[PDB]
Amino acid sequence: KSYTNNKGKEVLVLWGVHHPPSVSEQQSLYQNADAYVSVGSSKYNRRFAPEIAARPKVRGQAGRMNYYWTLLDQGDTITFEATGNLIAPWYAFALNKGSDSGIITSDA
Amino acid sequence: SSFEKFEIFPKASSWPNHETTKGVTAACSYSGASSFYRNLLWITKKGTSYPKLSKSYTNNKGKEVLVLWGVHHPPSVSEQQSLYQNADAYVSVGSSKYNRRFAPEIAARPKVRGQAGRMNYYWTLLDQGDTITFEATGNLIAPWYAFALNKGSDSGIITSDA
Numbered sequence: 001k002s003y004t005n006n007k008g009k010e011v012l013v014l015w016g017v018h019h020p021p022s023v024s025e026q027q028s029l030y031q032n033a034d035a036y037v038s039v040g041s042s043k044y045n046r047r048f049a050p051e052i053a054a055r056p057k058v059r060g061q062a063g064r065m066n067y068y069w070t071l072l073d074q075g076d077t078i079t080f081e082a083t084g085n086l087i088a089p090w091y092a093f094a095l096n097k098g099s100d101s102g103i104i105t106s107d108a
Numbered sequence: 109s110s111f112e113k114f115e116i117f118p119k120a121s122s123w124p125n126h127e128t129t130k131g132v133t134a135a136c137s138y139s140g141a142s143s144f145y146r147n148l149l150w151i152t153k154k155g156t157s158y159p160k161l162s163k164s165y166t167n168n169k170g171k172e173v174l175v176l177w178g179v180h181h182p183p184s185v186s187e188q189q190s191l192y193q194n195a196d197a198y199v200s201v202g203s204s205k206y207n208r209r210f211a212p213e214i215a216a217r218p219k220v221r222g223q224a225g226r227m228n229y230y231w232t233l234l235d236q237g238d239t240i241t242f243e244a245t246g247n248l249i250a251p252w253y254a255f256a257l258n259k260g261s262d263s264g265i266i267t268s269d270a
Contacts, residue, residue, distance in 0.1 A: 051209040054162060055202030056239045064207060 001088075004077040009094045011072040015039070015080070016087030019050035021062040026052055026084075035084020039068075042076045050085050071095075109260035116165055116175070116254050119149060123250070125159050127152040135221045148178055149252040158193045162243040163250075171256045173234040177201070177242070178249030181212035183224040188214055188246075197246020201230075204238045212247050233257075 005011050017037055020026050027033060038047045055062060065087070072078060080086060119128050131150025134142045144150060167173050179199055182188050189195060200209045217224060227249070234240060242248060 051200070053200035053202055053207075053209055054241055054243055055207060056164075056204065056241065058204055 001081075002077055002079040005072055005074060007094045008074050009096065010074070012069060012093045012095055013072060013078065013089055014067065014069045014092070015089050016068065017048050017050070017066045018085050018087060019064060019066075020052060021054055021064075023052055025063070026050070030084045032084050037080070037082040037084070037086050039070075039078070039080055041070070041072065041078045044070050044078075048085075109263065110258045111174075112169075112256040113253055114256065116251055117149075117163065119252060122163065123149075123151065123161075125154060126161065127154045133223070135223045147176065147251070147253040149250045150180075151248055151250055152191060153193060156193060158246070160243075160245050161248070162241065164239055164241040166239040167234055167236060169256045170236050171258065172236070174231060174255045174257055175234060175240065175251055176229065176231045176254070177251050178230065179210050179212070179228045180247050180249060181226060181228075182214060183216055183226075185214055187225070188212070192246045194246050199242070199244040199246070199248050201232075201240070201242055203232070203234065203240045206232050206240075210247075 020029060023033065026035070036047055036049050039045070055064070070078070080088065117123070128149065128151070130152055132142045132144050136142070136144050182191060185195065188197070198209055198211050201207070217226070232240070242250065
């Protein structure tokens with residue numbers, strides 16, 4: 001699935017890649033023991049493969065998930081192409097400018 | 109400031125299926141003979157059979173633990189076949205905040221210290237509580253000692269000849 005922008009502003013796109021802990025779980029969730037996802041644009045290009053391994057539980061889950069983000073430009077497109085693990089984006093953000101901001105940790 | 113060296117996986121009991129000894133090379137030669145590192149442990153096979161291994165560890169020392177390991181990869185496919193019986197291999201290390209799968213690579217490259225293979229070394233700080241799991245099918249250089257670390261800042265390294 002692809003997408004082009006036309007907003008005239010940069011678009012901030014997020015996605016994720018799941019990978020289960022057991023081969024039976026991979027078989028159960030996606031029917032395909034081999035898998036990959038692949039993301040392409042003009043200046044971004046990566047192919048991801050899942051990995052299946054045993055690891056201790058956190059929040060009662062043994063799987064893991066990785067999160068990624070990319071700034072598009074005006075004009076240029078983006079293409080997702082996947083066969084086993086895509087956590088597809090469902091909303092995104094169009095960004096303005098105006099500098100000199102930040103993050104504050106305070107309790108006032 | 110200071111640490112305490114202890115033994116995570118003892119050589120006698122923790123590896124009952126594989127071959128603990130015969131993991132020795134001539135590039136680490138001590139007193140004329142051949143030897144190997146004193147904190148790591150090469151692992152080979154006990155009778156041309158390499159079962160899949162998985163071993164875990166939790167800490168309880170209340171301090172952070174500094175764990176080292178290594179991944180060997182030979183230069184030739186025959187050497188991979190000879191040392192581990194499995195043309196395909198991987199190791200995998202997991203914890204709460206560390207997660208990586210490694211694959212060996214086999215290629216030709218010039219000799220250094222009369223060896224054509226290579227070996228990569230890795231390290232991780234555990235926390236108090238949290239566990240760690242090694243899981244391997246072809247190339248693990250398992251840890252054999254580790255370190256429990258104290259605090260007390262403002263130290264460093266000096267190169268001097270005084």
